[PDB]
Design a protein around this ligand. Structure first.
Ligand SMILES: N[C@@H]1CCN(c2c(F)cc3c(=O)c(C(=O)O)cn(C4CC4)c3c2Cl)C1
Ligand SMILES: N[C@@H]1CCN(c2c(F)cc3c(=O)c(C(=O)O)cn(C4CC4)c3c2Cl)C1
Lengths: 196, 432, 433, 198
DNA sequence: GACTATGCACGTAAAACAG
DNA sequence: CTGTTTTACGTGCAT
DNA sequence: AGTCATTCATGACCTTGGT
DNA sequence: ACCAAGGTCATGAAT
């Protein structure tokens, strides 16, 4: 199901959202020296439960390691978060070094884009402050890891906008990431949302 | 380069914040609708859907591409739901064939279904017409959107879980609350409890639940009769007839307890889920944030928040009247010098030079001059000689009337009563 | 009751008739489009989605195609649509999408949830004159809107896209010209402009194409370089077929070794005709509102005559609209003369209706004459039109003669159609291949 | 996958088009004293091929009989034909008596329907939107899209086939000749040729 | 949001046919 | 193990 | 055109837990 | 086989 490979030199194994993205990546692989993801909340069930998950297990299949540059592309979809959230938790509570090393991290998709001239052809990563640098012409807005050849504007350059994870985590953070994601016991979560 | 790095103490806090604030698209204490609703009810409106049945793919499509980023069958799937009269009180959209069985009945894709907006349904969208409810931009920034329809019908307590009721109890109360703002004991007199489309035990319980924001009980519509040849026959006609139809037959497979003692039915009814139910955990979003409410808060926030809705109705309409009566009051006064102006405009030069040049003859205004300069040669019939005259006091009466609704705290309510009473008829839910 | 009965000698004849007449929704010799196309290209139009404007989603565009002009189910509709996105399947893509069109390889495109697209420039061509009563137009199925029965089409999409082999707008117009000024034409001289069909993705079978062009059927051939790899070895690899089964067919050859930067070049000759690495033209569609087989000369044939009725309609209306304009003008001018009397006449006249009638006097003006006068709107009582309108009488009158000329002149007519088709050969101008 | 049953008294086993129809029938069974169909061209492959077809096989499963009132509802879709065509051929070249008896036949869906008064109900219906349609401005008309849309469903359902068709009636021989000229698919040349009355 | 079967033709590139 | 008829595989637009 | 898996709470209803 | 902590299943709206 992945998108082939080559040499274990710099590793490189990107995870995309939904067969559409992972399709747009696989055919657009302007940078594969891919694997669709349709992800359980690690800390949410039995370890046996978790191995029974095609999603978890798949990720364990590709690249061996086992419980003893792997980048993840989401979108912008607040829905696109929750899918960053689990991945990272599923790379934490399991495959600790993977991140602890920091070889495997999380991608920064694009946002607003400008384009003018009908038939005369002619991007940005924060449609907030960064957007102001860019009437007469025309603007845009990014819907998701959908839409986007282009695709390898985030693709071709070695992660022109990539994010390195876990950097100096440390302890007492495990405390928090099992306050939020995991899904403690209700009371904690309703409660972390006193800064929202 | 490799861009920066960041804590997963960092990344998994800020991400999951985004996703939690998107847990604030829950049913507003006011509209009594969850956005992927509000959007769907308004896409239907905008498009004008009285009229004939519209397909789906088109109605969804349009919902799912001018007012809702997400994918399609989140959009429509939901839609359908609003077709199911055995899930709501007043279905906010009427489809036809095949809505869905009380049993496991997969409804048909957008390929087949066809539906359109419902009467009751209008209620809630019955005054977006003017600058009623407060209104925002699209996601594509293409059209613009309402942030919670203004809603006559208190869909919130008539449909975080909120138990069905009946427009009838709901208006009847709603009235009481108005003229008597400040006990839940007297207020349960109008709504003894929540009505389900498909008898409930737990009086004491509902009673406390209405302020507490609890657990009730639910019993099935099955009676008793005597079958031919001298035998027993006791069978049945927001639960699910899917797992209930099988739970009986399951009881019968082991015989460990239906036109086949009556105490046995009492034991099966509280075991086979044939009369389980229910729960009432009233909870939604108020003040643009998540809170739990009760029977009194709901009517509460809705009465005040509807109050701002009726007042806006005044704000504009009055605005539109004033604007009208000043064009009139203008247009009349014209008649006097109809001959001079019809001569003034000829000589005037270009169109622009003409309205200015209407400095003389009168002290008329731009908006005044406009209509005069666009008065279109037909209407040089002075039919308006006496008529317009009558208008000055016509549009002027409505001007006083609406402005009255703005100053009068007591008269305001009387409007909201007349109207709500009105739906209780037009619509008028039967009891249950 | 049990209603009547009937022969299965009876029922299975009449049913399968229905279904066979629905086998007559095949690509018209003219528009060069199959209905579930024509519908899709016009839904896009009606909705204003030209190359110009911004990308429209899908579900909405399909939705709208699939519910005002196409009974059938959704992904028959769009699925098709996509196709028109694939520039490596057609010559001039009639719709430009973005963001997973489809790989040369097994690449499932994404549902209507994701894709977004809009009408293409070239694409306009074919819809570039529905504007007026060009092509002949019918009702909806729901009887809601109405539909075109085959877009009028500048670009001969039929021979540029029952199977019909791609070509190039350039060969196709170049010929198309020849045919006009020289109707009766051997296929031998006409192949001079189109040596054969162009595929977006070199063909062998000269003799064969040559006979195929009149025969309406036949078989041609299709061919897919060499270099020396470092260290002294061989390196001969590749960059309407399918790169899906070809990419594997090589590797399959290599698994059995029974015959690629990897020692004779004759081996590649043997693999090219075995592994399908370098593996027809059966021209056939619908003419006269019925199914026939055509050739290289019939196609241009029916399209030249059937385009000819298209250019003549363009005249029919536009001229019609001019006349209508010049008579309102010719009216409105004449008004100026008695602007003072009429501006007095209309005042006293009573009701609106009584006013236009009452314009029996002052002039012998007509209803349509009277109308505009009575709706002339008080701004325009600026007599700016005093001299101007005067000029109009000969302006709109010139266009009136011009268009009517296109209607009488058999030779001048063609010259229009040449200028235009030449025009797309530029604007569009497909490179050779 | 069917829609249950009861007593073998009058048989009764309707076949609908697509899970949507067969859904609209199953829940609307105002008349079941059902089975979705997603059908090969019988005479088009090996008899072994045919038994390998979930479609053919299913039909053979429900109601035994084997190669040694079963009504079929289609639509109006010209596409809805081809799906009558195979069914009947698959009830012919196999299960000859089934039809030969004539217990199992083919249904006549509705066409145009009139309805007026917004909120005052008042509807109609008709089975030929040609001549029969003329018997029916002021109000509003309609047109039937397919066995889709349509409670109502049992306007064709509840009454014992108020518009049903009895099949095969006095077939006879020399007709097998023709039904293997058209449907089966013959060898190209025959089919292009039966379409000289079209 | 990608799985899964079929008609409809027309190619021809792969199984099975005999001793 | 040869050459033969038979069999399956693919492709757009529909269910 | 229905198939298939999960988040995200929150319950009442069915699994093992031990000997 | 007792009663108890544990494990499941269903539900809209999103992927
Ligand atoms: N495994 C199964 C056999 C039945 N089936 C179906 C099915 F049942 C329904 C549809 C369908 O509604 C549809 C559309 O109009 O929206 C398009 N398609 C095709 C483009 C995919 C359908 C298919 Cl393949 C395949
Ligand atoms: N592991 C699982 C199997 C099920 N599933 C999917 C999936 F991949 C995508 C969608 C989907 O896009 C969608 C929509 O809004 O258009 C709606 N639904 C649900 C209403 C049916 C989806 C489902 Cl269930 C994948």
């Amino acid at each position: 199901t992945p998108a082939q490979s080559k040499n274990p030199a710099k590793n490189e194994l990107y995870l995309v959202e939904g067969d559409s993205a992972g399709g747009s990546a696989k055919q657009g692989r302007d940078r594969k020296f891919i694997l669709p993801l349709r992800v359980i909340n690690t800390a949410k069930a039995k370890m046996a439960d978790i191995l029974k998950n095609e999603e978890i297990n798949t990720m364990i299949y590709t690249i061996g390691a086992g419980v003893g540059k792997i980048i993840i592309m989401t979108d912008a979809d607040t829905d696109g978060a929750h899918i960053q959230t689990l991945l990272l938790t599923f790379f934490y509570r399991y495959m600790r070094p993977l991140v602890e090393a920091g070889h495997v991290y999380i991608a920064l998709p694009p946002l607003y884009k400008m384009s003018k001239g009908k038939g005369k052809k002619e991007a940005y990563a924060w449609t907030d402050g960064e957007l102001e640098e860019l009437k007469g012409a025309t603007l845009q807005r990014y819907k998701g890891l959908g839409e986007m050849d282009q695709l390898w504007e985030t693709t071709m350059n070695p992660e022109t906008r990539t994010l390195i994870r876990v950097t100096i985590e440390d302890l007492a953070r495990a405390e928090r990431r099992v306050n939020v994601l995991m899904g403690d016991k209700v009371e904690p979560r309703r409660k972390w949302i006193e800064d929202n | 380069q490799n861009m920066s790095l960041e804590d997963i103490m960092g990344e998994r806090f800020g991400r999951y914040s985004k996703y939690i604030i998107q847990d604030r698209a829950l049913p507003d204490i006011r509209d009594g609708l969850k956005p992927v609703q509000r959007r769907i009810l308004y896409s239907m409106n905008k498009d004008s859907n009285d009229k004939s049945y519209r397909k789906s793919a088109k109605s969804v499509g349009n919902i799912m591409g001018n007012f809702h980023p997400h994918g399609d069958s989140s959009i429509y799937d939901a839609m359908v739901r609003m077709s199911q009269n055995w899930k709501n009180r007043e279905i906010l959209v009427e489809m036809h064939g095949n809505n869905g069985s009380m049993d496991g009945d997969p409804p048909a894709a957008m390929r087949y279904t066809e539906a359109r907006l419902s009467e009751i349904a209008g209620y809630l969208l019955q005054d977006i017409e003017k600058k009623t409810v407060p209104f925002a931009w699209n996601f594509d920034d293409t059209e613009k959107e309402p942030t919670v329809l203004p809603a006559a019908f208190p869909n919130l307590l008539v449909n975080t879980d909120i138990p069905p009721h009946n427009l009838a109890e709901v208006i009847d109360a709603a009235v009481y609350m108005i003229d008597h703002p400040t006990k839940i004991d007297k207020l349960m007199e109008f709504l003894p409890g929540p009505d389900f489309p498909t008898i409930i035990q737990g009086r004491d319980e509902i009673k406390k639940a209405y302020e507490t924001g609890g657990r009730v009980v639910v019993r099935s519509k099955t009676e008793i009769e005597k079958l031919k040849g001298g035998k027993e026959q006791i069978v049945i006609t927001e639960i699910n007839k899917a797992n209930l139809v099988k739970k009986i037959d399951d009881v019968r497979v082991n015989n460990k307890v239906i036109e086949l003692t009556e105490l046995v039915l009492n034991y099966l009814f509280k075991y086979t889920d044939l009369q389980i139910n229910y729960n009432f955990n009233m909870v939604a979003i108020d003040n643009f944030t998540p809170r739990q409410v009760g029977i009194v808060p709901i009517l509460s926030s809705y009465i005040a928040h509807r109050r701002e809705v009726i007042l806006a109705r005044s704000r504009f309409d009055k605005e539109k009247a004033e604007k009208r009566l000043h064009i009139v009051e203008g247009l009349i006064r014209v008649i006097s010098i109809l001959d001079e102006v019809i001569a003034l405009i000829r000589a005037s030069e270009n169109k622009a030079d003409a309205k200015e040049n209407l400095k003389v003859s009168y002290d008329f205004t731009e908006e005044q001059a406009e209509a005069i300069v666009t008065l279109q040669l037909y209407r040089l019939t002075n039919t308006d000689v006496v008529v317009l005259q009558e208008e000055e006091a016509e549009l002027r009466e409505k001007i006083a009337m609406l402005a009255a609704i703005i100053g009068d705290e007591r008269t305001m309510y009387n409007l909201m009563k007349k109207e709500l009473r009105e739906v209780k008829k037009k619509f008028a839910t039967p009891r249950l």
